[PDB]
Amino acid sequence: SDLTFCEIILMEMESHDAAWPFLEPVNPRLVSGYRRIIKNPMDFSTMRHRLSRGGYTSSEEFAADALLVFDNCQTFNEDDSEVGKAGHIMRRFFESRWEEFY
Ligand SMILES: Cc1c[nH]nc1CN1CCN(c2nc(-c3[nH]c(C)c4c3CCCC4=O)cs2)CC1
């Protein structure tokens, strides 16, 4: 049940218009400095893969990964960049849907 809400929220983030930067891992070969700056990469397919495996104990671990996506985004991208702007939309989406359950 704690993971049935995570399925709902992850499904809704995956299909969100602003999700396009976060659907697959950043490729550090294409992004100068990414590997140096982002210690713990995270993205939605990685969360999906881990949810399919059953690798989440509670919903808080799920939220930890979600929040990590948007912490990384705000660490690497300017708030007015195209990726930064998408990340703010996705972050506010996640925080609001999360509170709409817990
Ligand atoms: C499914 C879809 C919908 N619209 N377009 C597509 C296909 N996409 C094509 C473009 N793409 C892209 N991701 C990024 C991306 N993401 C993050 C979290 C980034 C970056 C840049 C470096 C900084 C950073 O932290 C840039 S370009 C991947 C997917």
Curated annotation (Swiss-Prot):
All residue ranges annotated as the Bromo domain in the record: 1-101
Localisation per UniProt entry: Nucleus, Nucleolus
Domain statement: The bromo domain and the PHD-type zinc finger recognize and bind histone H4 acetylated on 'Lys-16' (H4K16ac). These 2 domains play a central role in the recruitment of chromatin silencing proteins such as DNMT1, DNMT3B and HDAC1.
Subunit structure: Component of the NoRC-1 ISWI chromatin remodeling complex at least composed of SMARCA1 and BAZ2A/TIP5, which regulates the spacing of histone octamers on the DNA template to facilitate access to DNA. Within the NoRC-1 ISWI chromatin remodeling complex interacts with SMARCA1; the interaction is direct. Component of the NoRC-5 ISWI chromatin remodeling complex (also called the NoRC nucleolar-remodeling complex), at least composed of SMARCA5/SNF2H and BAZ2A/TIP5, which regulates the spacing of histone octamers on the DNA template to facilitate access to DNA.
Task of the protein: Regulatory subunit of the ATP-dependent NoRC-1 and NoRC-5 ISWI chromatin remodeling complexes, which form ordered nucleosome arrays on chromatin and facilitate access to DNA during DNA-templated processes such as DNA replication, transcription, and repair. Both complexes regulate the spacing of nucleosomes along the chromatin and have the ability to slide mononucleosomes to the center of a DNA template. Directly stimulates the ATPase activity of SMARCA5 in the NoRC-5 ISWI chromatin remodeling complex.
Protein family (similarity comment): Belongs to the WAL family.
Taxonomic lineage of the native organism: Eukaryota, Metazoa, Chordata, Craniata, Vertebrata
Protein name: Bromodomain adjacent to zinc finger domain protein 2A
Gene assigned in the entry: BAZ2A
Tissue: Expressed at moderate levels in most tissues analyzed, including heart, brain, placenta, lung, skeletal muscle, kidney and pancreas.
Record PTM text: Deacetylation by SIRT1 in late S phase enhances pRNA-binding, allowing de novo DNA methylation and heterochromatin formation. Acetylation is high during S phase and declines to background levels in late S phase when the silent copies of rRNA genes are replicated. Ubiquitinated. Deubiquitinated by USP21 leading to its stabilization.
